[PDB]
Design goal:
The structure is cut from a larger assembly and holds two copies of chain A (221 residues). The first copy, chain A, is mostly helical and 221 residues long. The first copy, chain A, has helices at residues 17-29, 36-43, 49-56, 63-83, 101-104, 111-118, 126-145, 161-175, 179-192, 196-205, 211-217; strands spanning 2-4, 10-12. Chain A is elongated, with a radius of gyration of 23 Å. Chains A, B: One of its GO terms (cellular component) is host multivesicular body.
Chain lengths: 221, 221
């Protein structure tokens, strides 16, 4: 992250060892469950590209996930270079240069360059964009590691309705289908795969019933 | 039917043999099911009273049905004579006379008379009224031959709801009850005679639910 010294200047501060260890525990203990993404977003709050690469070093022992992340990052960097062509000409002495795709990811840039780029009026967030690319890669990884399809999430004969709903929505978040497909799933498949008693109640409830009404009507069933 | 010759004059055309054979197949193969009436209406499209009597000759071997038809036709002809008294006095040379009950049914009239009566500005449809009388007789016949009461139409334990609805409405069309009685039947008896699962769902659905909502809620039950 970025901190201010006693002289009022923006200075980079390294990630604390226990934050890095929390990230390591998340990587090594949760098997790339969907909750890894909110935890990564929280643990990398206000980070620099060098800090993000330090956090990514934890993923390196997982070859498939790391390769997927690297492919996503390279594609995003190529797209960034395509959409931000290197202008040929003079540059104002008071204005800093434009970083490239290899520079936002911190492959060739330095710490001071990123500190200056992030701290500006108006600021151009380089850490946030790299973080978003990491999140795209992580979403792909979570999709790859998902053990069950949404079509295989069925309510147990004695399973409470709220637990079935939680499992269903967790699997839906893992799968990351299209928005229209997701809406169709939440509207139709959730009712379709319920157990007979809750299914009868939900059918009696009618189409267009909100999730709150369904959980109310199926609370003790 | 009526066709126009090369000189622009209305000329009667006989019913084609295959249309008559289709009518014969309907009469001899469907046992006076309710669908006989739409088929007769389609097959006698734009017909003359002579054509209608030709079509009625097929019904003659069925003594009860033919007797019921003849009673209905005679009653309608008597009512027509009562409501259209024979005026005594002069008749305009350019205006044709008024046919009687025995004349609309083609018992005493000729082909040219019916052709002239139907082709007029404004036209007086004699074929359509005779056809409506035939349809009244056929409705009576379909009521006579109905094998089951509406009270005996009950959904089977594994019968789909749509098939039960189709059978129920076919029987209702066969029985031809009063409109208020029919409304009461469709509103109450259909729910009453359903199988337990669909009955529970429909009771939960409440009174005043449309047929579409009921079939939606009972689709896979």
């Amino acid at each position: 992250p970025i901190v201010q010294n006693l002289q009022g200047q923006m200075v980079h501060q390294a990630i604390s060892p226990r934050t890095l260890n929390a990230w390591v525990k998340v990587v090594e203990e949760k098997a790339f469950s969907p909750e890894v993404i909110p935890m990564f977003s929280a643990l990398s709050e206000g980070a620099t590209p060098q800090d993000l690469n330090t956090m990514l070093n934890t993923v390196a022992p997982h070859q498939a996930a790391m390769q997927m992340l690297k492919e996503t990052i390279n594609e995003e960097a190529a797209e960034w270079d395509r959409l931000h062509p290197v202008h040929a000409g003079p540059i104002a002495p008071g204005q800093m240069r434009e970083p490239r795709g290899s520079d936002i990811a911190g492959t060739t840039s330095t710490l001071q360059e990123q500190i200056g780029w992030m701290t500006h009026n108006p600021p151009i967030p380089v850490g946030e964009i790299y973080k978003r690319w990491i999140i795209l890669g992580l979403n792909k990884i979570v999709r790859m590691y998902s053990p069950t399809s949404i079509l295989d999430i069925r309510q147990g004969p004695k399973e409470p309705f709220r637990d079935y709903v939680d499992r269903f929505y967790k699997t839906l978040r893992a799968e990351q289908a299209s928005q229209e497909v997701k809406n169709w799933m939440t509207e139709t498949l959730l009712v379709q795969n319920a157990n007979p008693d809750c299914k009868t109640i939900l059918k009696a409830l009618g189409p267009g019933a909100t999730l709150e009404e369904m959980m109310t009507a199926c609370q003790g069933v």
